[PDB]
Design a protein around this motif. Sequence first.
Motif, PDB file in Angstrom:
ATOM      1  N   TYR B 170       0.847  -1.166   0.000  1.00 38.40           N
ATOM      2  CA  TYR B 170       0.000   0.000   0.000  1.00 38.40           C
ATOM      3  C   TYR B 170       0.879   1.210   0.000  1.00 38.40           C
ATOM      4  O   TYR B 170       1.474   1.488   1.024  1.00 38.40           O
ATOM      5  N   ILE B 171       1.066   1.812  -1.164  1.00 40.49           N
ATOM      6  CA  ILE B 171       2.121   2.821  -1.413  1.00 40.49           C
ATOM      7  C   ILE B 171       1.898   4.016  -0.535  1.00 40.49           C
ATOM      8  O   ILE B 171       0.815   4.579  -0.450  1.00 40.49           O
ATOM      9  N   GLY B 172       2.898   4.361   0.263  1.00 36.54           N
ATOM     10  CA  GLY B 172       2.842   5.570   1.092  1.00 36.54           C
ATOM     11  C   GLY B 172       2.481   5.201   2.485  1.00 36.54           C
ATOM     12  O   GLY B 172       2.861   5.773   3.500  1.00 36.54           O
ATOM     13  N   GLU B 173       1.674   4.106   2.648  1.00 37.55           N
ATOM     14  CA  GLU B 173       1.261   3.611   3.956  1.00 37.55           C
ATOM     15  C   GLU B 173       2.499   2.952   4.562  1.00 37.55           C
ATOM     16  O   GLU B 173       2.723   3.141   5.789  1.00 37.55           O
ATOM     17  N   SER B 174       3.396   2.272   3.819  1.00 36.55           N
ATOM     18  CA  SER B 174       4.609   1.642   4.433  1.00 36.55           C
ATOM     19  C   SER B 174       5.531   2.624   4.955  1.00 36.55           C
ATOM     20  O   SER B 174       6.242   2.344   5.910  1.00 36.55           O
ATOM     21  N   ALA B 175       5.638   3.833   4.375  1.00 30.31           N
ATOM     22  CA  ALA B 175       6.585   4.877   4.716  1.00 30.31           C
ATOM     23  C   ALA B 175       6.376   5.433   6.115  1.00 30.31           C
ATOM     24  O   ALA B 175       7.373   5.786   6.745  1.00 30.31           O
ATOM     25  N   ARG B 176       5.079   5.643   6.461  1.00 33.06           N
ATOM     26  CA  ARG B 176       4.724   6.426   7.667  1.00 33.06           C
ATOM     27  C   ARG B 176       5.111   5.870   9.020  1.00 33.06           C
ATOM     28  O   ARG B 176       5.583   6.555   9.875  1.00 33.06           O
ATOM     29  N   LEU B 177       4.998   4.581   9.173  1.00 31.54           N
ATOM     30  CA  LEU B 177       5.277   3.857  10.401  1.00 31.54           C
ATOM     31  C   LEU B 177       6.778   3.984  10.757  1.00 31.54           C
ATOM     32  O   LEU B 177       7.209   4.282  11.877  1.00 31.54           O
ATOM     33  N   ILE B 178       7.622   3.781   9.701  1.00 36.04           N
ATOM     34  CA  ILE B 178       9.087   3.821   9.808  1.00 36.04           C
ATOM     35  C   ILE B 178       9.619   5.197  10.241  1.00 36.04           C
ATOM     36  O   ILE B 178      10.506   5.190  11.122  1.00 36.04           O
TER      37      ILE B 178
ATOM     38  N   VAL G 161      13.146  13.983   0.368  1.00 35.26           N
ATOM     39  CA  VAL G 161      13.367  12.573   0.419  1.00 35.26           C
ATOM     40  C   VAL G 161      12.507  11.933  -0.596  1.00 35.26           C
ATOM     41  O   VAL G 161      11.351  12.369  -0.736  1.00 35.26           O
ATOM     42  N   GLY G 162      12.969  10.931  -1.359  1.00 36.33           N
ATOM     43  CA  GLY G 162      12.233  10.258  -2.402  1.00 36.33           C
ATOM     44  C   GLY G 162      11.086   9.534  -1.913  1.00 36.33           C
ATOM     45  O   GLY G 162      10.123   9.473  -2.571  1.00 36.33           O
ATOM     46  N   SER G 163      11.038   8.982  -0.665  1.00 33.20           N
ATOM     47  CA  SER G 163       9.795   8.358  -0.125  1.00 33.20           C
ATOM     48  C   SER G 163       8.660   9.305   0.210  1.00 33.20           C
ATOM     49  O   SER G 163       7.450   8.929   0.231  1.00 33.20           O
ATOM     50  N   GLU G 164       9.031  10.589   0.505  1.00 38.04           N
ATOM     51  CA  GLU G 164       8.147  11.593   0.923  1.00 38.04           C
ATOM     52  C   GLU G 164       7.212  12.034  -0.189  1.00 38.04           C
ATOM     53  O   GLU G 164       6.066  12.385   0.109  1.00 38.04           O
ATOM     54  N   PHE G 165       7.631  11.861  -1.510  1.00 36.29           N
ATOM     55  CA  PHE G 165       6.767  12.091  -2.681  1.00 36.29           C
ATOM     56  C   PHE G 165       5.591  11.133  -2.734  1.00 36.29           C
ATOM     57  O   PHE G 165       4.463  11.518  -3.077  1.00 36.29           O
ATOM     58  N   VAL G 166       5.810   9.856  -2.432  1.00 35.67           N
ATOM     59  CA  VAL G 166       4.701   8.929  -2.478  1.00 35.67           C
ATOM     60  C   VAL G 166       3.802   9.058  -1.218  1.00 35.67           C
ATOM     61  O   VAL G 166       4.199   9.525  -0.201  1.00 35.67           O
ATOM     62  N   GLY G 171      -4.362  11.331  -4.352  1.00 33.28           N
ATOM     63  CA  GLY G 171      -4.014  12.264  -5.410  1.00 33.28           C
ATOM     64  C   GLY G 171      -2.903  13.156  -5.037  1.00 33.28           C
ATOM     65  O   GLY G 171      -2.539  14.001  -5.885  1.00 33.28           O
ATOM     66  N   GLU G 172      -2.341  13.032  -3.839  1.00 36.14           N
ATOM     67  CA  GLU G 172      -1.286  13.978  -3.455  1.00 36.14           C
ATOM     68  C   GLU G 172      -0.016  13.677  -4.191  1.00 36.14           C
ATOM     69  O   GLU G 172       0.672  14.624  -4.443  1.00 36.14           O
ATOM     70  N   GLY G 173       0.296  12.444  -4.536  1.00 42.23           N
ATOM     71  CA  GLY G 173       1.606  12.063  -5.019  1.00 42.23           C
ATOM     72  C   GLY G 173       2.108  12.796  -6.232  1.00 42.23           C
ATOM     73  O   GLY G 173       3.260  13.328  -6.179  1.00 42.23           O
ATOM     74  N   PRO G 174       1.406  12.884  -7.372  1.00 40.32           N
ATOM     75  CA  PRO G 174       2.013  13.525  -8.595  1.00 40.32           C
ATOM     76  C   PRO G 174       2.032  15.040  -8.416  1.00 40.32           C
ATOM     77  O   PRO G 174       2.862  15.821  -8.863  1.00 40.32           O
ATOM     78  N   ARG G 178       4.709  18.926  -8.193  1.00 33.35           N
ATOM     79  CA  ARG G 178       4.375  20.237  -8.752  1.00 33.35           C
ATOM     80  C   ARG G 178       4.559  21.341  -7.807  1.00 33.35           C
ATOM     81  O   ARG G 178       5.094  22.383  -8.226  1.00 33.35           O
ATOM     82  N   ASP G 179       4.121  21.164  -6.552  1.00 31.28           N
ATOM     83  CA  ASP G 179       4.171  22.201  -5.530  1.00 31.28           C
ATOM     84  C   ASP G 179       5.555  22.556  -5.138  1.00 31.28           C
ATOM     85  O   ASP G 179       5.884  23.703  -5.269  1.00 31.28           O
ATOM     86  N   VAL G 180       6.527  21.630  -4.780  1.00 29.23           N
ATOM     87  CA  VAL G 180       7.891  21.941  -4.468  1.00 29.23           C
ATOM     88  C   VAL G 180       8.686  22.546  -5.695  1.00 29.23           C
ATOM     89  O   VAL G 180       9.510  23.407  -5.480  1.00 29.23           O
TER      90      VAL G 180
END
Lengths: 272, 252, 74, 51, 195, 288, 209, 289
Positions: B170-178, G161-166, G171-174, G178-180
């Motif tokens: 679940y993309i983005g959901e894995s990031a948050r916990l870490i 950070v590259g994870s912070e984009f996803v 709908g926030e991801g793409p 644009r915003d930064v």
Amino acid sequence: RGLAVGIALVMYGRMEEADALIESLCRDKDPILRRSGMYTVAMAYCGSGNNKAIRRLLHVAVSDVNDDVRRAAVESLGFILFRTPEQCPSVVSLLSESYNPHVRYGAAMALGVCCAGTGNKEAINLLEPMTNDPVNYVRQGALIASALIMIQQTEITCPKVNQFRQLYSKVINDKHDDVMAKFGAILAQGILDAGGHNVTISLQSRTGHTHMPSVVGVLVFTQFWFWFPLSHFLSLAYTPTCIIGLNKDLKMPKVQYKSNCKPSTFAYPAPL
Amino acid sequence: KQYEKSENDLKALQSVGQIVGEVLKQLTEEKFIVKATNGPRYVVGCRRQLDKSKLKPGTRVALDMTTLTIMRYLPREVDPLVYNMSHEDPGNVSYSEIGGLSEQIRELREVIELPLTNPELFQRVGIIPPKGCLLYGPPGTGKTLLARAVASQLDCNFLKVVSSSIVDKYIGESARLIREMFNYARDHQPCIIFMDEIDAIGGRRFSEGTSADREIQRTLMELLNQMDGFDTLHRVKMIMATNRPDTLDPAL
Amino acid sequence: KIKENSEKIKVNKTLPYLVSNVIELLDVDPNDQEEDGANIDLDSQRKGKCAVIKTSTRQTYFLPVIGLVDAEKL
Amino acid sequence: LNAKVRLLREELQLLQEQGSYVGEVVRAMDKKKVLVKVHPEGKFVVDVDKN
Amino acid sequence: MVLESTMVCVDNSEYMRNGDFLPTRLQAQQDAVNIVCHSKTRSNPENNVGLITLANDCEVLTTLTPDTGRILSKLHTVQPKGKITFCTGIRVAHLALKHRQGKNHKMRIIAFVGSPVEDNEKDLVKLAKRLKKEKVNVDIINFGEEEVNTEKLTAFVNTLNGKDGTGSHLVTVPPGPSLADALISSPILAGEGGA
Amino acid sequence: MPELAVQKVVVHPLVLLSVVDHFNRIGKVGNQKRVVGVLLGSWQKKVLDVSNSFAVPFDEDDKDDSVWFLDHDYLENMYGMFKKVNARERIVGWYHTGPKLHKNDIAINELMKRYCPNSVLVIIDVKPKDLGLPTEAYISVEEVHDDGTPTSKTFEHVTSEIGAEEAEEVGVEHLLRDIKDTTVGTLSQRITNQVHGLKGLNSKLLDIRTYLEKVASGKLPINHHIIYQLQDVFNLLPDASLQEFVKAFYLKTNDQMVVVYLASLIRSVVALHNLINNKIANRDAEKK
Amino acid sequence: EFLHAQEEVKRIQSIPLVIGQFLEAVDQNTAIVGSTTGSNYYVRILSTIDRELLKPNASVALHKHSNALVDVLPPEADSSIMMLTSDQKPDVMYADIGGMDIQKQEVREAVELPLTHFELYKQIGIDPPRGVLMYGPPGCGKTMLAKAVAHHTTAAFIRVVGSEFVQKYLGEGPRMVRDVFRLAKENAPAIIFIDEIDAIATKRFDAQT
Amino acid sequence: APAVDTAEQVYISSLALLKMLKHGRAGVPMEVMGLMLGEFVDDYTVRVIDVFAMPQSGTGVSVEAVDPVFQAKMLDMLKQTGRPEMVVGWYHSHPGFGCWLSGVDINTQQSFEALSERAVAVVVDPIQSVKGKVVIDAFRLINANMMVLGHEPRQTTSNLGHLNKPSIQALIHGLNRHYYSITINYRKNELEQKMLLNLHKKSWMEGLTLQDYSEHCKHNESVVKEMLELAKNYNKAVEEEDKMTPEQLAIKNVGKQDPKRHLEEHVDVLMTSNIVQCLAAMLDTVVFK
């Protein structure tokens, strides 16, 4: 409301005294009194135009964005300009552009009264956008205006007469239109057909000078926006006009008269 | 008593289903720019009553669903999972049952235990205590027993985290916990954070694999920056546990 | 009087209804949380016990939780 | 100027709507419904306004 | 009384500290003012009393309420500054009386005297015409001008009597040990037409 | 009690409106008498924004000073009541109904301090007059007098301004048959401001002038303030001097003209042809 | 009257507002946007707003009642992250990685000289640098060079950070990209630093998921 | 279904309307309410003289929101003023919603209707408003069946009526079920109108005032400097601008960020600013001496 219209009614053909009344009613706290003041000048002045009466009305309306006055100026015109019946559409062409629905209402009522007996091509077209506009009062006023000019004129004179009936009918069958419009439509129908086109509402008599009952009758009738039994006053405006003869003993001769036109076309052509 | 409980319910229904957001950046006193935890980004107002000063981008706000005005202030964001990790600190196993390992035990204390009491000891040396601990060993030794066993005896705040199921698809959901566990520890200082079976998150070059090899890398990237990148730990220490140091990413 | 207020609850209790998970339980007092200053005073946090609940439809919802539901499980 | 304000009162009620979406037409059907694919939401068969 | 708006005017003087009433005049008048209020409430619950001070410059203490409490608390305080400022007490009272939370009731002034009344005959007579025209009566309880002074007050009270069914009263209370209550002599607890 | 905590005073359109109404509402008590009300609003704010007012019964004599009636009951019941709805709004004070500041005012003020947590004297000049504002703000200051007795109570003026919330401004426009008057705006407004300034200055000078005549003969006191102000005018001797003109305006309209003409050229063909169409258009419309 | 009429439109332009991002202007009457909701809208444009600053990409406001384009937001406002690691900068300079002379001269010339002064580099004739790629053995310490320059400027350093984009939120991801980026254009010059692109963007993407 | 009722035309006074705006802005977003004081005159007209509020609560627009303590307390005091007024109805605000009543709100309207059937609920919107003409509507509130039959227009007579849409089809439907928009008239006049007009008497000092000469120079400098920047585009503008299509013109001759609009705008501020400052300095000189 009762007392307010009543102050206007008593005047007719006594121009100068009314100039006093109208300003005082307009200044007051009551919105109703503002509209009644216009009626006051319209009647006193109906007899011959002047510059004075139109000028008085006109300044109040431009100065302010007040709705009650703005309709009043434009309304007041038709009665006074009556003498040259073209003129009322001239002043009203600039006034019908106004975005205020008030002005737009007042523009239609004015055109209705002036043109009633001796019509104009220009007056007809001005009424069309008011009908279109979605506000409730602009539409009712416009549909009643259309009918007034059209009375004692047959449905073969031009196609417009026919069109006017179909519109009235459309609205009354409908529930998709406004309540206020249903009243304007029915009333409108009622005026146009009345007495089977042998009853008339005109600006002047065939003598050549003002036919007082018709003029009076229309203005008292146009209010019904609040209180609905008011519409029945229209009866005074309705006057029979038929060639009838006189016998020596006061009864009806069955004499003949010549007519320049074929009398067959005018025997109520095209009804529903 | 029953009527009081019934009263709050109506408050939700009047706002129609209240939603959580956060203040992204303050445009002016009236207008804030809010990024929502639910989805769309929003331009928002504030109640006359509710002060502007209270709201912060470090923290969360609540919005009326139907007019988008901030009703009130809400506390700092913390995941549901992390609340369960902090609690999990007594999992039992006393200091007696982990003995014989005692020489290696002394080495773990130098790193983890000393900066809690005083970072001052390493400061006199003129060195900043060494970052990250790695526990590794052949199976059955008790690399996980040890980390767990001292955490209970002291009973300090210790987050015990299973990281062999924390990655999801679940993309983005894995990031948050870490992320949340590092942030949290800085707040609840002193703290220790132990991740067990982070062999899972330990990644490799991959790039001919399934969808399962892909999710591991995002998490593995995040850890790198958090340690040393531009972000770094303090008194708080992060402990890793593995089975193989060979399963690990070359960069890690 | 309890029954009028609960009827709205009953319709939400009946089908369709979702399952979710609890991100935090705030459980603050209905009694004063702080006197707000600024233009008009009063309190804006007149919320009772509250919970920030995450729906499984990837949206986050704020909700005032009732007092009848046991606090401990939550 | 009068025209601008006249226009203006009508626009407010007109604008009140459930939104818009952007898709593309894969194919049309003969009966005058068009099979279009909305890019964020699902595909729909729905009619055209010819006004 | 039944449907009366009453303003009690309080005297606070350097002659109120006095010990002519045993043990002290202050206390003895305090029992009197409370009685007058408890009686009116017991009489009609719709009856209200108000407070103004005669002494010094005018302060409107309370407008119309049932409270005995307001009149009690004021009494404990003494005013060495101001005694009987009668002319003014009547005027504030008349004005005050008009606005009411027991509306369309009769208009009454009870003033307690307990100091020699400074005001001469010219003020007094003048005041009587203002009272007739507004149709408000004033009642005097007179232990303030038997104590070292001749009673100016009687003629004024007599003339004032019979302007309505709640006429004026001269209530006689001695100067020496006898308290500020000897209310038995003439009605004031509730209205009466007689003197 | 707080009167000193206000530097600046701002009033909503509401308060100015509300006062005129209260005057009648009490049962038409006026003439010599006045009508007062409570002012509800903010305090512990350097800016005083008076939110609302509600009517209070009052009889005033301003020719005497040993009689006034002030309704005690209304103030108290109203302060106690209001906390639940608004915890900031408390009784800010009372308005006086002209014609100007009196010493007659200190007395009424004193009572208001006791009852109410705050008081303030806002003087609204009588029944509706003027194009601009008719309110002045005063705070009761305690001063020493070095000739009489220290601790005298008097009134010192503070700046009066206006200001109101968004919803209220929107209301004013709807009701009203224009929006607001002059204080500064358009090109026309600035010049009006200049003429408005002259009639205004002239009024201030009459006050001083009529006073001097009265002090010289009729023995009104001689104060150092009045004399200080007059002397300065003669001393400063302002000297007319150069500058402040520009000629730029013409170039801009000329530049715009060339473009405006290119537009009229394309326009001409359609505009010219339309004239004929209109007369015919009216016949068609009437026919069908 | 026109002012009072303009005030009609002022009341609709208020909250609730949801932020979209303005793709392009077809006309000054209709336009295309793609909103942050995660849906795109083709909506109508009312009156009393500029399209002068809004014609290229910028943030824009839609009203949630109408779900149409009521108002405008500046291109600068609704920036996802503005700065980080310049108010969070490390204290590491060129003297804590005192060696690696060839490397030190390259970073300094590419990163520091365009932020501090764009004119000088351009003046010579040679273009000031655009895209930087940094490659080598991982054991050198690319991040550390990045640190030294992050400290030295103390402005115009955006750490992402590259994870912070996803993102989980819809709908926030793409949009987040644009915003930064759009903000870097406005507060020129500025450097965008992506730590590891070697574990977020991969050579193989399977695209069944 | 047949019943013989009349509609209530709501006459709101200027004083009353302004207070209703005041309360509604303040309450935001939480919905707040209050009672209306007035008089019943004629055979349908309820007039609102004044309004007061019932407390701000998050339990707002409810029967509960209504406080017995406020109501009694005010009414004793009101007797003294020489205006004890009738409760003609109650006003409320929705700043979370439009003119569509909430589900609690319909019950609350009903309780007022029992007390006096000449009772209305007026909805005040200040950030759920689409009109700056003051979005307010009036409801007496009668059942659903009355709309369905078509009975409800028979009862309303002596009405004009109107329909607006702050927020979509859902609101329209809610409105129709109720009693739709019954006519609101205003009781206003020139004295009240003059009070609202005002700004500053301080205009007296300000018309004459002019600033330090160094400041006059700052202004003149800033504008001439500015004008230089735009000037370079202006050359192109006059040479070309055959295009009349706003989107193409914008890219071509920097039509958007136009040098004509701004340069004119600039000459006009500089001219007017210099005139008023200069004109005042000279006027004061002659007059004071």
